[model samples]
Target: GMLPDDVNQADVLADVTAAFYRYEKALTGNDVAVLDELFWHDEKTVRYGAGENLYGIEEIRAFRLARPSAGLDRALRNTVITTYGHDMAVASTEFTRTGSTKIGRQMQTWVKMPEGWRIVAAHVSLMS
Candidate 1:
């Protein structure tokens, strides 16, 4: 579906930006529950990571729970969050883990639900 003519409205952008930052905090802090809550709990939801391809929320949850905790901290740069209409948004950012030479990139597609903003799709990759 196409966004309403009033896409990128200020209030809509603010909502998504808050969600994006919350997700980023959960990521760097390795807060699995918060991370899980941020994603849409549906089979169609997908997350492609640098090392894994998760096809559903369940798989994504499992990966998050099992991921190593030691290197979860990272500094994000060039973060961009853009909202469409009042219910859809995309967030993109570049990140680098402490002491790591590789730069990683992440993008997420978010949609507003009754509960709040939830990520419907996500991708993560690292510069080679």
Candidate 2:
């Protein structure tokens, strides 16, 4: 009998975990090159950011270039990463800035493409 046995397979989780941390590092540090590589470079790639709705990789790239880098620092907490089979997964985390009472949220949808692990979609928002 066939069954779905790839739930969080050790190898797949490790691969995604590495990519996840890389993304975290890039985001906080504004590592543009790393950010570009971590995200899937295609028309379908998307990011609903705190201030902008990026429709595709090109729009996402544009938004990234225009954002202010001064207030990029933040502390992340309660990170939850889950792998649904070997090819796709989700990473969610809560963050707080220097003087914010509201909570920030970041979630990404990662998928294994031919090149490597990359985020197909991402979102960043604040909880009021």
Candidate 3:
């Protein structure tokens, strides 16, 4: 097997970190516009949520729009982001919502595209 050089290179991590925070703000605020912009706009984009598996960008978009805007706030803990080379990254965090006892887990794959860094695939789940 071959491993690439420059894993978690500082500049690369910086970009993803910024994007991650932007996404976090958007998520907690139910800012659908920025949320939409942060995800890859393609059929291959995917998101697996706590209660639903969204297979494409359209499904993800619909899910975002249909979701109740209230109570979207959550706190993140043990957040980690790892970058491979300069164009790809994986970000993960554990979370707890405002009034829920369930601990949530999230993993997102980010890619640098022509537009900017975007989440290409993501997974979310929760258990007590």
Candidate 4:
């Protein structure tokens, strides 16, 4: 949902979004290698919804592990991007559930890293 040639002001931005999508793929598959490659290790990620706030990569991973099963056949859509400077961008997305689940919104902030576009933060919430 975050991939768009026109949305990105430059090819690098597009690349970053693409990288993010790929990493998400790895996440769904529960591939630790891809998680290690994408996450900051000492990750500064967070998630919030329904009055719950989860901080850091480890906590997020724990949340995944505690879940009944891996997130499956997920889809992200209505992606919109906004550039703050030459090096940073925010991708806001709408997710449509394929299985039984509540509807929500997801937003991600991607920062340009020496390696590529790495996610710095993310927030998820129910539509209200």
- Predicted structure with the largest TM-score when compared to the true one: 3
Which one is best on lDDT? 3
Model 2: lDDT of residue 93: 94
Q: Report the C-alpha lDDT of model 3 over 34-126, residue by residue, as the tens digit.
A: 999999999999999999999888999999989998888989999999999889999999999879988999999999998999999999999
- How are the candidates ranked when ordered by lDDT, highest leading? 3, 1, 2, 4
TM values, all candidates: 0.94, 0.93, 0.95, 0.71
Better model by TM-score: candidate 1 vs candidate 4: 1
TM-score order, best first, reads: 3, 1, 2, 4
Q: Give lDDT: candidate 3, residue 41.
A: 96
lDDT scores for all predictions? 0.92, 0.89, 0.94, 0.67
* Per-residue lDDT over 27-74 for candidate 1, one digit per residue giving the tens place of the 0 to 100 score: 989989999999999999999999999999889999998899997888
lDDT of 2 by residue, 1-128 (tens): 32467677888888899999988899889998899999999999889988788988899888889889987889989998888887899999999999888899999999999999999999999986
User: What TM-score would candidate 1 get against the native?
Assistant: 0.94
CA lDDT, candidate 2, residue 56: 82
- Residue 5 C-alpha lDDT in model 4: 44
- Angstrom error of the Cα, residue 41, model 2: value is 0.7
* RMSD (CA, Å), each prediction: 1.5, 1.9, 1.4, 5.0
What residue pairs are clashing in model 1? none
Cα lDDT, model 1, residue 31: 88
